[PDB]
Amino acid sequence: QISVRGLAGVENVTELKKNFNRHLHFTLVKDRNVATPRDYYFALAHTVRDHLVGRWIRTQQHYYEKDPKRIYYLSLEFYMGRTLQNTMVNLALENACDEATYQLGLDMEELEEIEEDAGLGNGGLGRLAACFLDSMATLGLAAYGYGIRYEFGIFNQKICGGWQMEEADDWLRYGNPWEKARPEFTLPVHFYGRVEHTSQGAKWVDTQVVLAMPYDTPVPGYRNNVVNTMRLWSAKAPNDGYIQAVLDRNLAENISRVLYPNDNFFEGKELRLKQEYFVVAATLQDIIRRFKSSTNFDAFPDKVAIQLNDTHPSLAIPELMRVLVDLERLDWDKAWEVTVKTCAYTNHTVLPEALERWPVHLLETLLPRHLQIIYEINQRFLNRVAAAFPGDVDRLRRMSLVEEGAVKRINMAHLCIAGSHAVNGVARIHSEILKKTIFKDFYELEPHKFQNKTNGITPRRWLVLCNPGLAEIIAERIGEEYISDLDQLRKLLSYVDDEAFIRDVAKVKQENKLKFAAYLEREYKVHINPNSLFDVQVKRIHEYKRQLLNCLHVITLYNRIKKEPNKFVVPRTVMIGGKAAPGYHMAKMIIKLITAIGDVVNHDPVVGDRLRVIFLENYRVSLAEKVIPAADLSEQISTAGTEASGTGNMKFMLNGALTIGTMDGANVEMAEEAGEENFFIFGMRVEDVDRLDQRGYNAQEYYDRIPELRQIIEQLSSGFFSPKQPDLFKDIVNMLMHHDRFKVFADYEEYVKCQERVSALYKNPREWTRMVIRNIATSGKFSSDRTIAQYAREIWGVEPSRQRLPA
Amino acid sequence: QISVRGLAGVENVTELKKNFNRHLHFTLVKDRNVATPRDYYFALAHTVRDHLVGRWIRTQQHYYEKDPKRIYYLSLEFYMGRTLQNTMVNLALENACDEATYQLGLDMEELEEIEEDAGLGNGGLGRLAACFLDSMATLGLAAYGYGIRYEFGIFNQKICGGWQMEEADDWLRYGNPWEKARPEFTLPVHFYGRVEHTSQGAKWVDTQVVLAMPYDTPVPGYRNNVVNTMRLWSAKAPNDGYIQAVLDRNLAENISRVLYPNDNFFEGKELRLKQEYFVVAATLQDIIRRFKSSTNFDAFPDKVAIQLNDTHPSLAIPELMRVLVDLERLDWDKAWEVTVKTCAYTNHTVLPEALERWPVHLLETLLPRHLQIIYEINQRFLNRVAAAFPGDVDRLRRMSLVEEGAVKRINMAHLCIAGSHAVNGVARIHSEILKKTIFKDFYELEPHKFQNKTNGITPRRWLVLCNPGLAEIIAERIGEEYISDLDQLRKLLSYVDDEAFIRDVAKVKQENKLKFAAYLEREYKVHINPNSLFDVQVKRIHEYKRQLLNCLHVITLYNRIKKEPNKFVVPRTVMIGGKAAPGYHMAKMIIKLITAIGDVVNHDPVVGDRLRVIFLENYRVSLAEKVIPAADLSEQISTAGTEASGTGNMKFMLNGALTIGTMDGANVEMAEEAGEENFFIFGMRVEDVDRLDQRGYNAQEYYDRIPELRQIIEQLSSGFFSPKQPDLFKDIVNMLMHHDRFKVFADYEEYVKCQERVSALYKNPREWTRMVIRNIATSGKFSSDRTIAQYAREIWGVEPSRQRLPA
Numbered sequence A, B: 001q002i003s004v005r006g007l008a009g010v011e012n013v014t015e016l017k018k019n020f021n022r023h024l025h026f027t028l029v030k031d032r033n034v035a036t037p038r039d040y041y042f043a044l045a046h047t048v049r050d051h052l053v054g055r056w057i058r059t060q061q062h063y064y065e066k067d068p069k070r071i072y073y074l075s076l077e078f079y080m081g082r083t084l085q086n087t088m089v090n091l092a093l094e095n096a097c098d099e100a101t102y103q104l105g106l107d108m109e110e111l112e113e114i115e116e117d118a119g120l121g122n123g124g125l126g127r128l129a130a131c132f133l134d135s136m137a138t139l140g141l142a143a144y145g146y147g148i149r150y151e152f153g154i155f156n157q158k159i160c161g162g163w164q165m166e167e168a169d170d171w172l173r174y175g176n177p178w179e180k181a182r183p184e185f186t187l188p189v190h191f192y193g194r195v196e197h198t199s200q201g202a203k204w205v206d207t208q209v210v211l212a213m214p215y216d217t218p219v220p221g222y223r224n225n226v227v228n229t230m231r232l233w234s235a236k237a238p239n240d241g242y243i244q245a246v247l248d249r250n251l252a253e254n255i256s257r258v259l260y261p262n263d264n265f266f267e268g269k270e271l272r273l274k275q276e277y278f279v280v281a282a283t284l285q286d287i288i289r290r291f292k293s294s295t296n297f298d299a300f301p302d303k304v305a306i307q308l309n310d311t312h313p314s315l316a317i318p319e320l321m322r323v324l325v326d327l328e329r330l331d332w333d334k335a336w337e338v339t340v341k342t343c344a345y346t347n348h349t350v351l352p353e354a355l356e357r358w359p360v361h362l363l364e365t366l367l368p369r370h371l372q373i374i375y376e377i378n379q380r381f382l383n384r385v386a387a388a389f390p391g392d393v394d395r396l397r398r399m400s401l402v403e404e405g406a407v408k409r410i411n412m413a414h415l416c417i418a419g420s421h422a423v424n425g426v427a428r429i430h431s432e433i434l435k436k437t438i439f440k441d442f443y444e445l446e447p448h449k450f451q452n453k454t455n456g457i458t459p460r461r462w463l464v465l466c467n468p469g470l471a472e473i474i475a476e477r478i479g480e481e482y483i484s485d486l487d488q489l490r491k492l493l494s495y496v497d498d499e500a501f502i503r504d505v506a507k508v509k510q511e512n513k514l515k516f517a518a519y520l521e522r523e524y525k526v527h528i529n530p531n532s533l534f535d536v537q538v539k540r541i542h543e544y545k546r547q548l549l550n551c552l553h554v555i556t557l558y559n560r561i562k563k564e565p566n567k568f569v570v571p572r573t574v575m576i577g578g579k580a581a582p583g584y585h586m587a588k589m590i591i592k593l594i595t596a597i598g599d600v601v602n603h604d605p606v607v608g609d610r611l612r613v614i615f616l617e618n619y620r621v622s623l624a625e626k627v628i629p630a631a632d633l634s635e636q637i638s639t640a641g642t643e644a645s646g647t648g649n650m651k652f653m654l655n656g657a658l659t660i661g662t663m664d665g666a667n668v669e670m671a672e673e674a675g676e677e678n679f680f681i682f683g684m685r686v687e688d689v690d691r692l693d694q695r696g697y698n699a700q701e702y703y704d705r706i707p708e709l710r711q712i713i714e715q716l717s718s719g720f721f722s723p724k725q726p727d728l729f730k731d732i733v734n735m736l737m738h739h740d741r742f743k744v745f746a747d748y749e750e751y752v753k754c755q756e757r758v759s760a761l762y763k764n765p766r767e768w769t770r771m772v773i774r775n776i777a778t779s780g781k782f783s784s785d786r787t788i789a790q791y792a793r794e795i796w797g798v799e800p801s802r803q804r805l806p807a
């Protein structure tokens, strides 16, 4: 038992054991003779959950009495992962439970592996919402996460013949002990219909009704007895030949059936639009209801803050207007004032294919009233633009919420800026790019709205939970206060020359690597050398993230070995993992290339154990908690200007891995905090990318001037990595040579050289570890507690609190 | 008075004072009422010289009795600089003399400034010989430096209208107190004549005779009572209408009249060839004479080692053969064996224009016998090649000592390799290049002959003498043993975090800078900001050294300031100095460009004191001792593969300056010793240069893709830096754009970026100084004591000794 895991009191261990047996008996209806590991997991889950209830009820009662300003975080994604350990950590029950289960003759670690990940997210954006909920609860904010309870989350990835296969993530199969259905608070949501204009106002009639049933999940703060709520809506058909009618109820309930598996990509499908309005309509009614129970809406903005996680819930703006104008009967101008002061929008990308632009004919049919409100908003907005920039007709066209052309569309990002009092990017460089390019016009009109809120990660899940060993050796030196005040890690700089610490840091990493090396053989049958440098790149598969640049380096290493077999090279285990959106062909081809390279490299006798290429199957939150603590090198190599922020990069930094990356997203602030000498920066900067575009990017130039790059391309083209299918990778080569939007070749040379410098430092264990300490020591700024405290003060207008609520 | 400067004993100070007055009276024939500072300097010089005599006579008597193997270092250049302080340092008389002169009411520093530099060298090669003599004496080797006593050394450089003007360096005008003429040892040297073939041998007859008169100068070792000799030959006509005959004596004496001012450039002039044979013929007779007084020459190689400093004294090989075969009557094969075992050759460059290739018709007329011997050597050499590589006719052509073509020439480098048992480069990368390219054929034939002897500098003159303040704060921590065992500086690494040391190191530098900043105003009327970063590049002006790349950066800084005047930039004082060979037009244009840039930059109100460009006039040894201790940044930016070693780079490293440079010459070993993170490395490596050549270097490409570079070129072309003469720099631009053998543009981008990193570190005083300490601490390998110890053991076959000879 380690200190950071809490006390294992005799009274509490005894209490846990009896409640464990009570649940196993009364709740699961089983006895020790027929109970399986899953039964034991649930008995424990229910036992831990019981400890939340009291605090949960009291926290909510507390908000009712004090009536603070409420923060509503709207997101279509909440990538929660597992809840058991996180709950134990935040309640300081980990050692007690470890002890209690030990005494019952059970291995708690084994039971934790049985819990299904709540995979209601695709990647960074969804996981950001998860870290945010944790930080908001830890900072005592009266916050509520509002989303959709998808029956099926992100698909489980299977690799067959080196190809990705998708299979339904039936995460609710065995039930979810953490959620509490609240059918009594079911609300109606309207779709279709038409707009009627009567004497006193417009009316939305003849609509199709779908019920929204909420499910509440507790969100415990870190040892402060605060337990907030994440409310997820589930679609239900109202109760009103016969057989078919009953069966068709599924049409309405399909709304919350599945999470769209696209990360950073817009797909204009009606079902997705229905999901977006569904969460918005139900959430706003719930918000107003709670407000009226605290009518004058002038104080609405003083009691409510609505944060739009990207444009997915952008319909909250016209929906809030619809309710205030049509139902509450406020005049337009009053309603608009309230709406703007209530909403804030967070942008997460600048990639054109990721921006939501909904076809007018779709909104017209599905939400006729909202379309009229959007036109009115646009009309009044453009009048302000015209008045500020008289005669600038092109600006009017560029800023319109309505896009003209083959098919009229609504630019949701433009709608969000117009209806929000604050708009923020997620990393300093990203926020600057928004003001310099994409939203330049809007910035010029309302400079005050634009802010930056650099992303962060919660040190609870991303340090204490996944890397107890490191959290422990740190606590031994500076105490435990850093867990909720990550800036304190700075104090570790005074130990950079401490021989004892240096040895402990390196020991923790070696233990993590052995632990992971073992895991890979257990549930996946793969052997790797624990002494090699663990080079890992885990994140969604996308061309801008350039897993292909990583592939080129791997092949370069392989060719150099084959060229001079008896030459010494630092051993490496290159791990690449991540899911590809089902319809993203190039991403699926990249996964195949990776496994293909592995097939060749991993079975070449000459290479031996000097180089290994493994594709980490089914990358998800639970897997991230295992791989990150074991990594030595973190690959953050997106083309400069494409990764808004990145968060995986922060996770690796906090866990002892050195970073090789471009000056993109948060990488810039990370290098800035640790010192550029303690980072492996390479490649073009944003400015260099623009210059290349002005000039015109010609991949052929690099192919002609770099012999090693040419050899690799020819190996791919000739079928060297695909014997039976010689032209299998033709699309990849064609893309790289003629239409590479991300300039893979342009950063190849500098990337390979930088990787050599990494291998050089790895050969010096002591100096590698000292650099690692400099990184961990300066990762404090990337705690989501800092991020949330900034949102609270600069956007929501509320003060974070670290005060503990009574037991 | 500082510790490292010795004791100021009461008996010695009293003795010095009386001898000072004795010399002022009896030697200079002056009294205190008419004595000028120069008179005082000489009185002191003679007083110090007296202390050398006893040790000098005893050292030589010692070598006579013990009869050790003698080392003869032949060089046409010995860039000695001033002798007064160096002598005091090596005899531990500096404080005593400082005190004694103080008591006589004189400032010793003032008197030292009166001594003329013995400028019998052009640059690195000549200064290397000087450092070597010092180290050989310090290591107790029975060594003799043999050269020419030029009446006029390297010309004094004057800058008029921004142009270099040359004026005679009449360094002997006031006499030289250090030398002792030895007319009694005058030897005859033969020229012209013809070869007669008699029954018993060939005879060289009807020759013109020129006498060689030796002048001996003492070379004191560091506090070991050893005093070796540097013997310099002076040309004298033999004593046998009348008036004209007497006046024509000058024709013969012109041989030792002036040093050819070319550095790294071959000029095939007859006078130069005469100088080369002159030093060789006189030296060898002196060597043999001394040997016969120790006949069988089988033991000659056991008692004599002849080191050829470059090919300048290459005629020693055929001259030794001539003497052994023609005069001593040894058979050819025996003579050749002795010659090869006696001679060793040191190469200092790979630039084609620097290799000596003498026209056969010249040798034919001037040294007919030597030409016959050279043909015989070639004949026998090629027979060995033919036997080792049967049928390889092209190799025979490539390796011949005789080059065919428009005009037959003798490749002196080929002659040296053939007649030497050892051939060495002067830096690891240079030595490797010799084996991979230029001498590849020879390396293949006799791999055993090729070695490396990385250059070094003497820490006496280049630390203790020129930077007493730094030598002192170092001694305070680790003692004084490092002065003759520079590796001990390593012990300074344990003080890198010592706040006291860090402050002292930075204090010493600031003092040096103030001292130099003052000097610039005193004897040159120029004001500079002592708080700015001192960016200096001092060395001979040559295109391969790329002073032009430095110029481009300076102009870049200037344009950036003008672009954003109110933006903060680290202040810089860019100092560039060095002489250009009189007939090297491009070098003279580069000097003009530098002053021209200064004219604009130094008078631009907007720039202020943020940027200053000064051309250091008349750069020479004495000036180097002043500027180097005051530098912050050392510019070593030659195109990779062109600077054989460089030595100025080592001087800066030992004195507290950080280095920005290419991976060329010794820079590679310097970075290797200090750690690449503590060096500012940039640009193409040798391999990158070759690739560019394969491809074909096109400067236009860089001009088209780099806006800032384009602006600079257009400023030069339009006359921005030369109003009255708009096309003044047309040749420079033309060269840069169409025939730049050194790829200035190719390293521009990386150079400018690297310079930004330098400015960034300078803004952090504490970290800049800590990096400085890491450099000084690892500069030990670059002491010439290490270099000489390697020559002694691996080439000359003698053991260095640190034992003190009796007083």
Ligand SMILES: OC[C@H]1O[C@@H](c2cc(O)ccc2O)[C@H](O)[C@@H](O)[C@@H]1O
Binding pocket: A122, A123, A124, A125, A126, A128, A263, A264, A265, A310, A348, A349, A354, A426, A455, A643, A644, A645, A646, A647, A665
């Ligand atoms: O802000 C959290 C992360 O959101 C990611 C993201 C952005 C989208 O627009 C859609 C999906 C998605 O995962 C960005 O790519 C990351 O750079 C950023 O760190």
Ligand SMILES: OC[C@H]1O[C@@H](c2cc(O)ccc2O)[C@H](O)[C@@H](O)[C@@H]1O
Binding pocket: B122, B123, B124, B125, B126, B128, B263, B264, B265, B310, B348, B349, B354, B426, B455, B643, B644, B645, B646, B647, B665
């Ligand atoms: O070896 C001492 C230095 O000799 C220099 C040199 C070489 C020549 O061939 C002629 C003159 C000359 O000064 C090289 O340029 C330096 O790189 C080297 O450090």
Ligand SMILES: *Cc1c(COP(=O)(O)O)cnc(C)c1O
Binding pocket: A122, A123, A124, A127, A538, A539, A540, A619, A620, A621, A624, A645, A646, A647, A648, A649, A651
């Ligand atoms: C943190 C995280 C992400 C985001 O990773 P990036 O490299 O920033 O894209 C994606 N997926 C999972 C499961 C994560 O834990």
Ligand SMILES: *Cc1c(COP(=O)(O)O)cnc(C)c1O
Binding pocket: B122, B123, B124, B127, B538, B539, B540, B619, B620, B621, B624, B645, B646, B647, B648, B649, B651
């Ligand atoms: C050391 C020295 C040199 C050699 O400088 P590099 O930069 O190696 O060329 C040339 N001139 C003088 C006066 C020196 O002291």
